[PDB]
């Protein structure tokens, strides 16, 4: 909702409450999953060509008792945009690989989980410096590219570490050395085609015997396709990764091949059914694991839109992973899940 628009400054205050419940034989995901998100997007006109902006988004879980608080910052960044040249922003933001993979992250509840948060340059993460050029100086409609740098996020401070520390340090599964990446997308009418590449130094804390997938750098290569017209949405992405994909709590995959596909239709009366397939196939994993499925599921669901502010959905994760030693060791969910959600948003 735009709550302020005066003398060239605009402020949009937005959010949602998702009354949400999971049904699953897996009791670690089963039960109340209610949550809310809040955010703001602000923009200020500096000149006719130059605009400054900032965005912040926060998630607060609504499913805990009052003696605890489970909340986090999704994004927080400030930036400058110049008409027909580009933009730059810095902060917690999305990695440029997400420019392509976001195209299949459109499912009612699940999806978008061949990668995670704080996972090199694949999704949300800290310390992104992002440069973007839209429409190639305004001379090629629909063509966009981006180049991104990520600074090191290392070991926690004040915990007796003698190397690799940063002020905002964290556990090794969520660390990263310096990284660089890029994306190109082209959209003509309904069609879209895109590609992205990322390369991040891996830290010493990540390259210990306690984690599978030791390596100097984490690399990702992504291609994507999209069709979005005539009430039909189709998209697919394929990603090859090296020492970049987490294998639950075990560490990372030496190599992984990720694939996601989605098909959706929008009825006039407000119903939007969705069908999707995701898989992540790991190779040469180490410790005798050899080749294993990290993720494999079919997602069938539907959303009903009452209007732009109220909707309800059901999403059914038909989980094709089988319960074995590998998935047990990594703590990967192999059970089906049904989600039922009712969402108010502004």
């Amino acid at each position: 909702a735009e709550v302020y628009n005066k003398d060239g400054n605009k402020l949009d205050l937005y959010g949602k409450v998702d009354g949400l419940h999971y049904f699953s034989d897996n009791k670690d995901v089963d039960g109340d999953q209610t949550y809310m998100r809040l955010g703001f997007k602000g923009e200020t006109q500096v000149t006719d060509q130059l605009t400054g902006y900032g965005q912040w988004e926060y998630q607060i879980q609504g499913n805990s008792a009052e003696n605890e608080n489970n909340s986090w910052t999704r994004v927080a960044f400030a930036g400058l945009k110049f008409q027909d040249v580009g933009s730059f922003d810095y902060g917690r933001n999305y990695g440029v690989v997400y420019d392509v993979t976001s195209w299949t992250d459109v499912l009612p509840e699940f999806g978008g989980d061949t990668y995670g948060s704080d996972n090199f340059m694949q999704q949300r993460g800290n310390g992104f410096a992002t440069y973007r050029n839209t429409d190639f100086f305004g001379l090629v409609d629909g063509l966009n590219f981006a180049v991104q740098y990520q600074g090191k996020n290392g070991n926690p401070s004040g915990e007796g570490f003698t190397s690799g520390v940063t002020n905002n340090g964290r556990d090794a599964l969520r660390q990263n050395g310096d990284g660089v990446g890029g994306s190109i997308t082209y959209d003509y009418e309904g069609f879209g085609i895109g590609g992205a590449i990322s390369s991040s130094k891996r830290t010493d804390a990540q390259n210990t015997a306690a984690y599978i997938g030791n390596g100097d750098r984490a690399e990702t290569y992504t291609g994507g396709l999209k069709y979005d017209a005539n009430n039909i949405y189709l998209a697919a992405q394929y990603t090859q990764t090296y020492n970049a994909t987490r294998v639950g709590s075990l560490g990372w995959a030496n190599k992984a091949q990720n694939f996601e596909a989605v098909a959706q239709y929008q009825f006039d009366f407000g119903l939007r059914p969705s069908l999707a397939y995701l898989q992540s196939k790991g190779k040469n994993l180490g410790r005798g694991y050899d080749d294993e499925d990290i993720l494999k599921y079919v997602d069938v669901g539907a959303t009903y839109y009452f209007n732009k502010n109220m909707s309800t959905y059901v999403d059914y994760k038909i989980n094709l992973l089988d319960d074995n030693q590998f998935t047990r060791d990594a703590g990967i969910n192999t059970d089906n899940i049904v989600a039922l959600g009712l969402v108010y948003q502004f």
């Binding site: 306690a210 709590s249 075990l250 060791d329 990594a330």
Partner: peptide, 23 residues
């Protein structure tokens, strides 16, 4: 989901033989 590491432990005990100093 090798190096020696020092650790410290502490507990109680009961003297059970005063002559032999058995605890």
């Amino acid at each position: 989901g090798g190096q020696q590491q020092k650790f410290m432990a502490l507990g109680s005990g009961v003297i059970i033989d005063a002559d032999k100093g058995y605890v």
